[PDB]
Amino acid sequence: DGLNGTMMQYYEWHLENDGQHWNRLHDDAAALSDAGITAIWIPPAYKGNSQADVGYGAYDLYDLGEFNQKGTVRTKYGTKAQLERAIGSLKSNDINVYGDVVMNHKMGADFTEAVQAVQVNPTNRWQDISGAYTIDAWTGFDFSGRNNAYSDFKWRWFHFNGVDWDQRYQENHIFRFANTNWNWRVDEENGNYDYLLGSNIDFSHPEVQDELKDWGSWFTDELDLDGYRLDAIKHIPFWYTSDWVRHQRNEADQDLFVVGEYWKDDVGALEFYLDEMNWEMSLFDVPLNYNFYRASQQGGSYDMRNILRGSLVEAHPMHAVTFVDNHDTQPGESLESWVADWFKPLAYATILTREGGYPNVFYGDYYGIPNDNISAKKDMIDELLDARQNYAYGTQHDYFDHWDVVGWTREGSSSRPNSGLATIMSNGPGGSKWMYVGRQNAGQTWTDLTGNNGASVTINGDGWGEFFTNGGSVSVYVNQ
Ligand code: NA
Ligand code: NA
Ligand code: NA
């Protein structure tokens, strides 16, 4: 229908482990759709190492909070039945469902096995730093409580090629199983970045290749997914992710949107990865996340003309999923690069009102993060979502021509009456800027949807208007 698409990551790292999240998502469906959310990215929905696991310490991909394993039936988010009910609600409310997919490793093995392994250089996994010797690694998975439902596949050490914990001498080291190779090709930071955490899956084995492809199809069909969020893909052999994606699209009738999480503040690396994927998916705009972080951290001295420089959205807008923060970047987490409250509005306006990129709203920003006394930004975000949903249409014009004051416009499209907007912001002292919003909007008087500026901007005969912004603020003018 031409409507702009907006994704929302429906969770934050410190969410309460009350098992009521799927129920919350179910009840929130109508409100989310009305607000402008068109797709929901659910966290890993399968059994993790423990009930409180956020989902990345993935134990059993076939247990969606249905079997008593790892000390619980439900996952941190709820039961399988509640999840399916939530998805049903999202579907009836015209919201796509993307499932987080964790296939890089497994955790919470039921038992250890004796394995010959060598210690490697943490900063160069290609380099062994010890001779081979026997360690006890958590590689045995029997999925007892599942009783082979859906799949009788069992994991053993020979399905993996590394771990970072030896249970025998109880020490942390980056271990490569003797006689096994690190996956390839993978990111090259640390020489070979195949290993990240837990028991690292070795995709050189056909049985592993087929198991995850079959699980993928089972998962897709079980939850009637509309796409996936691929976890830690820079650590998974590129050739396999591509095969896996092609396999799923082949097995599923519905379209499948795919966004990969290749975590690197390097647009070149992300473009190379997309090349390897034949551009068959989009990637989170990690460089842009760091651009926002750099600006938030530096303060007003940050030159706004560079805010989009080096970002994926700047180079391949149609293959970039833009975001401001996520469960990994929030305070105290592994990829911390949190955008402070003062800059956050500007960052969200940037990903929500521009034509390029598939923007994602963070649950933590939307509803807040009580754990860190971070307020819900729903008020501000809803206004930007309103702008995106009803006004961000038509030919765009950019004005990243000042170190403090930058902005852009959208002429709007005939198909969508009254559409059109002018976004202007400043990370330092306030200011103004003449911008072209389209001669077809001549004579209109636009006002700030955010309420941050009371100026009424009347579009002149040539389609130009002078928009104003206060300092460290953002305004989005529309014909309302
Ligand atoms: Na890996
Ligand atoms: Na961030
Ligand atoms: Na500045």
- Which long-range CB contacts under 8 A does 184-189 form with residues at least 24 apart? 184/237, 185/237, 185/238, 185/239, 185/276, 186/234, 186/235, 186/236, 186/237, 186/238, 187/234, 187/235, 187/262, 187/264, 187/269, 189/264
Task: State yes or no: 26 annotated in a binding site.
Answer: no
Could you tell me if 107 and 58 are in contact, meaning their C-beta atoms sit under 8 angstroms apart?
A: yes
Rounded Cα–Cα distance for residues 265 and 384 (Å): 26
Resolution (A): 2.2
- Ligand 3 geometric centre to CA of 452 (Å): 19
Could you tell me if 174 and 125 are in contact, meaning their C-beta atoms sit under 8 angstroms apart?
A: yes
Which segments of 288-367 are extended strands (E)?
A: 320-321, 360-362
Could you tell me if 181 and 204 are in contact, meaning their C-beta atoms sit under 8 angstroms apart?
A: yes
Letter string b/e over residues 412-433, b meaning 16 or more CB atoms within 10 A of that residue's CB: beeebeebbbbbbbbbbebbbb
The experimental method is X-ray
Torsion over CA: 424, 425, 430, 433 (sign): negative
- Ligand 1 geometric centre to CA of 324 (Å): 26
**SS3 at position 52:** coil
Could you tell me if 245 and 280 are in contact, meaning their C-beta atoms sit under 8 angstroms apart?
A: yes
Residue partners of 140: CB distance under 8 A and separation at least 6:
109, 110, 111, 112, 113, 155, 156, 157
Q: Which of 225, 206, 208 is nearest to 217 (CA)?
A: 225
| Structural domains of the chain, ranges and CATH numbers in brackets | 1-103+206-393 (3.20.20.80), 104-205 (2.40.30.140), 394-480 (2.60.40.1180)
Rounded Cα–Cα distance for residues 315 and 273 (Å): 14
Q: How many CB atoms lie under 10 A from the CB of residue 116? A: 13
Rounded Cα–Cα distance for residues 473 and 407 (Å): 12
Q: Any idea which residues carry the catalytic annotation?
A: 231, 261
Task: State yes or no: 448 annotated in a binding site.
Answer: no
Rounded Cα–Cα distance for residues 265 and 295 (Å): 14
- Ligand 3 geometric centre to CA of 304 (Å): 5
Which ligand has the shortest distance to the CA of 285? Answer: 2
- Ligand 2 geometric centre to CA of 311 (Å): 13
**SS3 at position 418:** coil
Task: State yes or no: 404 annotated in a binding site.
Answer: yes
